[PDB]
Design a protein around this ligand. Structure first.
Ligand SMILES: CCCCCCCC(=O)OC[C@H](COP(=O)(O)O[C@@H]1[C@H](O)[C@H](O)[C@@H](OP(=O)(O)O)[C@H](OP(=O)(O)O)[C@H]1O)OC(=O)CCCCCCC
Ligand SMILES: CCCCCCCC(=O)OC[C@H](COP(=O)(O)O[C@@H]1[C@H](O)[C@H](O)[C@@H](OP(=O)(O)O)[C@H](OP(=O)(O)O)[C@H]1O)OC(=O)CCCCCCC
Ligand SMILES: CCCCCCCCCCCC(=O)OC[C@H](COP(=O)(O)OCC[N+](C)(C)C)OC(=O)CCCCCCCCCCC
Ligand SMILES: CCCCCCCCCCCC(=O)OC[C@H](COP(=O)(O)OCC[N+](C)(C)C)OC(=O)CCCCCCCCCCC
Ligand SMILES: CCCCCCCCCCCC(=O)OC[C@H](COP(=O)(O)OCC[N+](C)(C)C)OC(=O)CCCCCCCCCCC
Ligand SMILES: CCCCCCCCCCCC(=O)OC[C@H](COP(=O)(O)OCC[N+](C)(C)C)OC(=O)CCCCCCCCCCC
Ligand SMILES: *[C@@H]1O[C@H](CO[C@@H]2O[C@@H](C)[C@@H](O)[C@@H](O)[C@@H]2O)[C@@H](O[C@@H]2O[C@H](CO)[C@@H](O)[C@H](O)[C@H]2NC(C)=O)[C@H](O)[C@H]1NC(C)=O
Ligand SMILES: *[C@@H]1O[C@H](CO[C@@H]2O[C@@H](C)[C@@H](O)[C@@H](O)[C@@H]2O)[C@@H](O[C@@H]2O[C@H](CO)[C@@H](O)[C@H](O)[C@H]2NC(C)=O)[C@H](O)[C@H]1NC(C)=O
Lengths: 514, 446
């Protein structure tokens, strides 16, 4: 799949030929309760980031790109990707790096007196050209140089960021509504409460903790000996939806305390009608777009392409591992072409360009994974779950009566569950756990029996240093340099690490398969 | 010697303060943390100096708490003075001991399972009561006075109590798991898990201590070697009454509660000590004498978690030191007054949940929900039909339901008699329903 055929668009045609013969099975394998449970789970997992990032985007760009734009982008691009993608289990949506770039480019346009929504159009043009060139010459073969080292550093960092951000949201709730002796019990609640409210922070904490606990307990019950096997598996596959329902009902019967609920736009409208309309004129809206910027849009285009390419391709590598028991194949070239070209086209309508996100895609793949009776029997690979998730995200503006009843703390508990369950299957996390167990309890794995304990710990420590560096870079005003700092783990593995470790240790600690 | 003494001291102190808090809350501090601590100390010193088996641990238990609550409820119903009725029960206990001077896994496990259920149910009931005192409301009155206790609902009190209870229970459970996990050096892991309950109490007490604005009810502890409620009573209880004359008819009917208390203490000795008689006589006599001073009667219990002359002397000094420290723990009133009752509720739930482990009735109740292919390789699974074992478990569950109904009614004082009625049930009716092989598998001494 990552070989170079020497022909123009050879990898793309190979991906299409390999995956499209499976289309009827991609439709029919969706007929299972597990697929429906995964649809509900991933629908919440995909809607909540869209709303959060759309709110932040509207705040940071003055509603030139807001919540409705991101919802429409996610829905349409997810539908097209589920219909035409070589790896239908990838979930394409907004991410933190994309928001950071949008902020930086909006700042640049404001400083230089340019229209931000037209500079985005030209960035999209350049993204289309660049991805077409990369797929013509099969540049996705470079993905073969990203080994388990980089894949697992990236996955662990993303999971840690997920968990940290949900906890920071909870801490923010506690900061807005601190526990006080007295309150101004007639606080105004529009648009959001203007002052501290009693019981709000503790109730949010309780709701998050209860959702997390019920999800984890139903996960345990799925793999337990209780109840008939089929009913047990069905109930445990609906574990996350059941926990969400339980906690939403708990919140529904407490009418006196305030908790923040999901908010969606009132309709399918642009966030700022005065700023721009549905279709962006590339030559400008209220002023002529400069030619020098028409050409200089190639560097922001290169940065955006690097971000999207790295994120999506590492996600594809993670979900397509041989251990996970995927058998229908994955197309790096086709998926890259689809995602980047769709983002470039969406820039022409003012919508965000998206990326195959790591935690969401891994959660989607795990929700479709069938556990054999501590082993992975198979994965329900099909195009219906992602299609239905994208359709539901595109219909969320019409689902206000239901979504307005769902607290954000329940979804925080679900996000904590996603973050913790995404750590499974990552050998870096296993080796981090081994740092605390005595050597006599270390598992029977090649890197435990073939590598001395202190050398394996040193390997894990170098990886932890890489993680710390990445976290610091992400926390600084140089956050946009993260993709390059992560790319630096490839030369670190292929050049620096051989100077420390021996070949046998490096093959044991960085094996292609487990 | 010192490490074991510290471990035993904390193992004695945690249940002591938990039960003292519950008992002081129920009885309006007629008996509370101070009385329980002083009784434990004095009776432990006496048992370390005189008790034939110095390895036995004498202290308050869940059955004793249940009986104390039932007797307080009965005295409230009949307008009697509870602390004087206790004195006459103690007189009768002493008389019974002077007069004196069969229990199978069936009865023992029904008893322990009932106590566990009571602990869990009482924890949740206390939390519900807290939520009733301080409902979640849009608005509150900030002029609420707090001299005896909050006179109206307060914000964050019920939710914070729930959080403290849940956190204490979760930390105790997590440290219990960590005790037997593969993490950290074995010695440090086992030491940390040994003191798991104290550590969880400390963590949640600190959490509550650094939250200063919200109110949570705390332990009621006097300053010094004093009674929990001086206005209600003093140290010496005059048998004829403190505020009202004590009825003579009750002076004679105190023999029945005395018999029930004797049954409970003997049952606890059988469950723990057996799994001897003079030690039980000493404990019952000491409890009867302690009732004269308004202090709880205790019960001896095994599983202290430990040339012949030297060994006995060493464990006699261990009990003497632990009892002296438990008596001096009332001087740690600055620390004890900072312990929220929700933390102790979490510890109560932890005790109830963790005592379920090792009960074959609980294991068979779990098997009720498992497919037969998943049933373990135990004699009552392989030598008994699945439905016969399930019928055995169901009859035991019916016993539990009858005991719960009795505990719920005004006749809850007679609960020990209904418990002892499971001995005739095991010996008479069960042989009619079941075969000897099934009774040997389902009710075994090992
Ligand atoms: C709503 C449930 C009603 C019961 C279901 C209605 C049907 C019913 O009567 O179930 C009886 C069931 C035993 O199930 P049963 O023996 O018929 O079949 C077993 C099991 O149910 C699965 O079929 C297989 O185990 P798994 O696939 O590896 O797991 C295995 O079949 P196979 O491997 O040979 O092919 C069998 O061992 O016993 C309970 O679990 C108690 C119910 C829980 C308590 C429920 C009441 C509180
Ligand atoms: C607060 C921690 C302070 C650590 C202080 C000092 C920590 C420290 O000294 O490290 C050595 C230790 C290895 O100990 P080591 O291998 O020598 O000894 C093993 C094990 O630790 C127990 O001693 C025994 O296992 P168990 O009895 O059957 O359970 C067994 O000894 P035995 O069977 O032959 O008798 C041995 O297998 O490493 C860690 O386990 C975690 C490190 C801590 C993790 C990193 C902590 C940041
Ligand atoms: C497991 C036990 C959890 C117990 C939680 C106790 C909450 C403590 C609240 C302190 C007072 C307050 O809420 O204050 C709000 C403060 C912000 O400070 P401030 O009020 O704006 O100003 C300072 C005013 N002081 C100095 C008077 C306070 O936010 C916080 O930093 C608290 C964040 C709590 C995060 C909860 C993490 C839960 C972990 C479990 C995850 C499932
Ligand atoms: C996530 C936060 C991480 C920090 C918390 C974990 C602490 C781990 C330290 C105890 C491990 C242990 O005790 O392992 C026991 C092993 C025993 O193996 P040995 O071959 O006999 O040792 C040979 C002794 N040398 C090394 C002197 C030759 O000793 C070790 O050499 C531990 C590995 C030390 C190398 C550096 C490890 C990476 C540092 C931690 C990651 C930043
Ligand atoms: C860990 C599992 C915990 C389960 C136990 C929870 C106990 C709650 C008992 C409430 C009943 C009650 O007491 O209701 C009290 C008030 C009614 O107030 P009122 O109508 O003004 O009447 C005034 C008083 N009365 C009724 C005597 C007249 O209602 C409430 O605000 C309760 C809110 C319940 C939220 C509980 C949190 C849910 C957590 C879910 C698991 C994470
Ligand atoms: C905790 C509150 C009680 C709730 C109990 C809910 C679980 C009920 C199902 C148990 C497992 C099961 O299904 O039992 C199945 C057993 C197995 O029979 P077998 O012929 O040996 O199996 C071999 C052939 N099979 C598999 C085709 C049947 O047969 C029974 O029906 C047991 C019922 C006995 C009656 C007394 C039950 C008492 C239960 C407690 C009520 C007071
Ligand atoms: C919604 O947009 C208005 C208008 O934005 C301005 O006009 C557009 C046509 C486009 O050229 C934008 O870049 C302009 O900023 C926002 O109101 C503007 O606020 C900025 C900052 O204070 C100010 O420079 C503009 O003059 C304002 N324009 C007007 C007409 O008041 C408004 O903030 C946006 N809404 C939200 C919620 O952010
Ligand atoms: C301390 O005790 C007082 C008084 O108890 C009295 O004496 C006992 C021996 C017994 O006869 C009781 O029934 C007597 O009440 C408690 O005061 C009572 O408090 C409750 C609860 O607030 C109230 O309903 C009663 O009316 C009060 N009775 C009197 C006579 O004042 C007091 O609560 C106890 N203190 C604590 C901290 O628990």
């Amino acid at each position: 799949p990552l070989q170079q055929t020497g022909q123009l668009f050879g990898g793309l045609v190979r991906d299409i030929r390999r995956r499209y013969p499976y289309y009827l099975s991609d439709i029919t394998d969706a007929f299972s309760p597990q697929v429906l449970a995964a649809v509900i789970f991933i629908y919440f997992a995909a809607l909540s980031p869209a709303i959060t990032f759309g709110g932040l985007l509207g705040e940071k760009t003055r509603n030139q790109m807001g919540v409705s734009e991101l919802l429409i982008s996610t829905a349409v691009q997810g539908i097209l990707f589920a219909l035409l993608g070589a790896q239908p289990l990838l979930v394409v949506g907004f991410s933190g790096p994309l928001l950071v770039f949008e902020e930086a480019f909006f700042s640049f346009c404001e400083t230089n007196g340019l229209e931000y929504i037209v500079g985005r159009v030209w960035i999209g043009f350049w993204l289309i050209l660049l991805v077409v060139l990369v797929v013509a010459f099969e540049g996705s073969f470079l993905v073969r140089f990203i080994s388990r080292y980089t894949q697992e550093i990236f996955s662990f960092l993303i999971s840690l960021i997920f968990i940290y951000e949900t906890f920071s949201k909870l801490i923010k709730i506690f900061q807005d509504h601190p526990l006080q002796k007295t309150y101004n019990y007639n606080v105004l609640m529009v648009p959001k409460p203007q002052g501290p409210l009693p019981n709000t922070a503790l109730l949010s904490l309780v709701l998050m903790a209860g959702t997390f606990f019920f999800a984890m307990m139903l996960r345990k019950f799925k793999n337990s000996s209780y109840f008939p096997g089929k009913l047990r598996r069905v109930i445990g596959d609906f574990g996350v939806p059941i926990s969400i329902l339980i906690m939403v009902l708990v919140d529904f019967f407490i009418q006196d305390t305030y908790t923040q609920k999901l908010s969606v736009p009132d309709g399918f409208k642009v966030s700022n009608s005065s700023a721009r309309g549905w279709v962006i004129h590339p030559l400008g809206l209220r002023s002529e777009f400069p030619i020098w910027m028409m050409f200089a849009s190639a560097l922001p285009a290169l940065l955006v392409f690097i971000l999207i390419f790295l994120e999506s391709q590492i996600t594809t590598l993670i979900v397509s591992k041989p251990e996970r028991k995927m058998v229908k194949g994955s197309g790096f070239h086709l998926d890259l072409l689809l995602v980047v070209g769709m983002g470039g086209v969406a820039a022409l309508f003012g919508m965000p360009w998206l990326s195959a996100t790591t935690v969401r895609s891994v959660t989607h793949a795990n929700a479709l994974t069938v556990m054999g009776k501590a082993q992975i029997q198979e994965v329900k690979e099909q195009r219906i779950s992602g299609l239905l998730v994208a359709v539901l995200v595109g219909l969320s503006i019409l689902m206000e009566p239901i979504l307005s009843r769902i607290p954000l703390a329940v979804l925080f508990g679900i996000f904590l569950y996603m973050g913790v369950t995404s750590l499974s299957g990552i050998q870096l996390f296993d080796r981090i756990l081994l740092l605390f167990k005595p050597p006599k309890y270390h598992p029977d794995v090649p890197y435990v029996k073939r590598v001395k304990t202190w050398r394996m710990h040193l390997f894990t420590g170098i990886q932890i240093i890489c993680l710390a560096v990445l976290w610091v870079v992400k926390s600084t005003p140089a956050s946009l340099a993260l993709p390059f700092v992560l790319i630096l783990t490839v030369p670190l593995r292929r050049v620096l690490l051989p100077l420390i470790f021996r070949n046998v240790e490096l093959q044991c600690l960085d094996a292609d398969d487990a």
